[PDB]
Amino acid sequence: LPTAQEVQGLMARYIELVDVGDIEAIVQMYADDATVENPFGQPPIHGREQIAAFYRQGLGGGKVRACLTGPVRASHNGCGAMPFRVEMVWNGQPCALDVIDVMRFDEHGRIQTMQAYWSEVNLSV
Amino acid sequence: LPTAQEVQGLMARYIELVDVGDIEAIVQMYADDATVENPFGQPPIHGREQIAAFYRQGLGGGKVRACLTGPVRASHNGCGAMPFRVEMVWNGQPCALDVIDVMRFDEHGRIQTMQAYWSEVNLSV
Ligand SMILES: C[C@]12CCc3c(ccc4cc(O)ccc34)[C@@H]1CCC2=O
Ligand SMILES: C[C@]12CCc3c(ccc4cc(O)ccc34)[C@@H]1CCC2=O
């Protein structure tokens, strides 16, 4: 599994790919069996093709940015958690969404699970 | 089952109790049979007594301080995640540890599970 240090690097790489909106590069970070819950509380999405659709719908339209708002917390079992802020425009309203993602990596360094904690209370104009 | 706003309030209250070292009130925020994984990656501890013993050892003498370093992220299914910083002593000097806790609350508003994401990569001097 990725070490704690490697998890910090991988999760920051993920943020960079979201921030520039490189949909195909994001998808390659995920394993073929990856399970994403985004937002946590909803039915998951499974596998690269379905995960690609999330990012294309979310990032492929208007300009979206993402940046870490604190350090990546990494564990000794290939897992980590990070706080970040997504900026977007929602029907003319400039918005920010505060999110925490929790990720578990597999032994090939790919994302096997991700949970994105956020809801509407985390949105602001 | 706490709404997203209620989760934000409960998790913020937890931080205040840690900051003032109110171990009895912290324990009462947990369900009687809750689990804590702290750090995430270690075996869960189970039940209010083990959880109490954990907070007594970690907080019992001061001068631990704790504060949120960003907003509480909350779901619609009674869960949340928060970034915070703990200030304590390591090797006789003041240190800081960045942590993310993920909590799931029961239908009585008590913490059923807590997972604390951090490792030594999050410890600074
Ligand atoms: C999809 C989205 C843009 C990107 C995004 C959102 C929410 C959680 C995310 C979590 C991620 O790990 C990466 C991107 C998002 C926004 C919710 C509404 C929206 O437009
Ligand atoms: C115990 C501790 C202070 C409190 C604390 C730590 C780590 C994770 C925590 C998670 C919490 O939800 C509440 C408190 C802590 C530190 C690890 C070493 C130390 O001094």
Swiss-Prot record, chains A, B:
InterPro entries named in the record: Ketosteroid_isomerase (IPR039256), NTF2-like_dom_sf (IPR032710), SnoaL-like (IPR037401)
- GO terms assigned for molecular function: steroid Delta-isomerase activity
Q: Which organism is it from?
A: Pseudomonas putida
Q: Which gene encodes it?
A: ksi
Binding-site list for substrate: 101
Q: Which domain of life is it from?
A: Bacteria
| Active-site residues, as the UniProt record annotates them | 14, 38
What is the enzyme's class at the highest EC level? Answer: isomerase
Name the GO terms of the biological process aspect. steroid metabolic process
Q: Which Gene3D superfamilies match?
A: 3.10.450.50
What inducers act on this gene? By steroids.
Q: How does it assemble?
A: Homodimer.
What protein name does the entry list? Answer: Steroid Delta-isomerase
Could you tell me the EC number(s) of this protein? 5.3.3.1
Q: Which UniProt keywords apply?
A: Isomerase, Lipid metabolism, Steroid metabolism
Q: Which catalytic reaction applies to this protein?
A: a 3-oxo-Delta(5)-steroid = a 3-oxo-Delta(4)-steroid
Outcome, altering residue 101 to A/L: Reduces activity 100-fold. Reduces activity 10000-fold
Result of altering residue 14 to S: Reduces activity 20-fold
